[PDB]
Amino acid sequence: QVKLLESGPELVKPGASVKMSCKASGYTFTSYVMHWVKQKPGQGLEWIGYINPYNDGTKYNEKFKGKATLTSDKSSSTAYMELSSLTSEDSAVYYCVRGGYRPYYAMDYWGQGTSVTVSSAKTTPPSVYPLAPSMVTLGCLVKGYFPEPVTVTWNSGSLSSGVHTFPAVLQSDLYTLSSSVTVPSSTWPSETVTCNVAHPASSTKVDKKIVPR
């Protein structure tokens, strides 16, 4: 099957450069161009350009010429995009997208995307606080961490419906996120409810059981 494997989230300082990769498989790498599209948080799509792996030829969106550099490696079927002189405007998710049968055809296979965060803020592990009060709503406050993302689950996935995990909000260089879970009141606290929080950037995991005040 056609697969596009992109590199993981990146945190980089303003003014530095970042390079991400897109390893293809499932087709003749050199038979299709590879486009790159930018998508800022909760915003539209913007075409950056493409490269033709077959001949290393490149077409750029003028706004990106001199900013983005598209390369390609036939031996490893991998396409790269480098961005220089990063600013906050560059924080966004970047996708490599396989072109159609012909370069001018509509793009058809989008990768999962590489999230890029441009900031001088330092990696900070989260503090995790319990939110304790015929349904009862409980919760978990994940505060002061950087960068994104953190994952939050309840009872390691056994509690899935009745859960609302809210998008993190940045404040003074640190993110804060909350998650609520609603369970039958009779079941709590006789049946334990625990939030499991993971923050891969600081290699931190925290399990917090919610107990009655």
């Binding site: 486009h35 539209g44 799509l45 913007e46 075409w47 350009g49 077409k59 969106n61 003028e62 996708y95 159609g100 001018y104 055809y105 509509a106 793009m107 058809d108 989008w110 990768g111 999962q112 995307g113 503090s127 606080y129 319990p130 939110l131 304790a132 009060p133 709503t137 919760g139 406050l141 505060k143 419906s161 609302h164 995990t165 809210f166 998008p167 993190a168 909000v169 404040q171 804060t176 996120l177 909350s178 609520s180 609603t182």
Partner: protein, 213 residues
């Protein structure tokens, strides 16, 4: 450069209903117009190309048309899986440009939020901080106003608000509002109130708690 214009920016519809969204090219592009569907948190998927040609796998209830500068995408008898965002993009040479998108959400009857308030956790208080959390869960429409009052006076500083995307099971929205204070300021007041004003009532919904209690 060439500019695309999509309308409407947002639309609400019911399952089984038929709707039409539009895209306008600043310059003639003939029939070289593609439409992409992007689900919340997913990568875009190609739906149509050449303005009227459905990509492989795309259901026939989808129907694109137009040519030149005015295009429309019609969806007959909408299904649950159709809600999300839609972007048009011309594929008439480079640079490629996208419309700003149309967010297609599910319509449901109005519903008041289920509001829960939580005082700072003893844990957090030991670190010098005091966050007060309020969940306004499963309400509709998305538009809502939250206010924090301390001993009667509204507090505007240190409030962090975050909204979830529409729930795919019940078509509602949820919101989390966190009022962050320092522990010693928290200890100087007794009454804390989360106040929500929603379309569903003239009387704001209120949840309160007293520190000394």
């Amino acid at each position: 450069e060439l500019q695309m214009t999509q309308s409407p920016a947002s639309l609400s519809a019911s399952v089984g209903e038929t709707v039409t969204i539009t895209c306008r090219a600043s310059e003639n592009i003939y029939s070289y117009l593609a439409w992409y569907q992007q689900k919340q948190g997913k990568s875009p998927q190609l739906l149509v190309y050449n303005a009227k040609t459905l990509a492989e796998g795309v259901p026939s209830r989808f129907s694109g048309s137009g040519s030149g500068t005015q295009f429309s995408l019609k969806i007959n008898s909408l299904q649950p899986e159709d809600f999300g965002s839609y972007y048009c993009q011309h594929h008439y040479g480079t640079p490629l440009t996208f419309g700003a998108g149309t967010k297609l959400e599910l319509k449901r009857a109005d519903a008041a939020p289920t509001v829960s308030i939580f005082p700072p956790s003893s844990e957090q208080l030991t670190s010098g901080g005091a966050s007060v959390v309020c969940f306004l869960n499963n309400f509709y429409p998305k538009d809502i106003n939250v206010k924090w009052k301390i001993d009667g006076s509204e507090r505007q500083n240190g409030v962090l608000n975050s909204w979830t995307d529409q729930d795919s099971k019940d078509s509602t929205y949820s919101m989390s509002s966190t009022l962050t204070l320092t522990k010693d300021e928290y200890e100087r007041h007794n009454s804390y109130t989360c106040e929500a004003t929603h379309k569903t009532s003239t009387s704001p919904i209120v949840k309160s708690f007293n520190r000394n209690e």
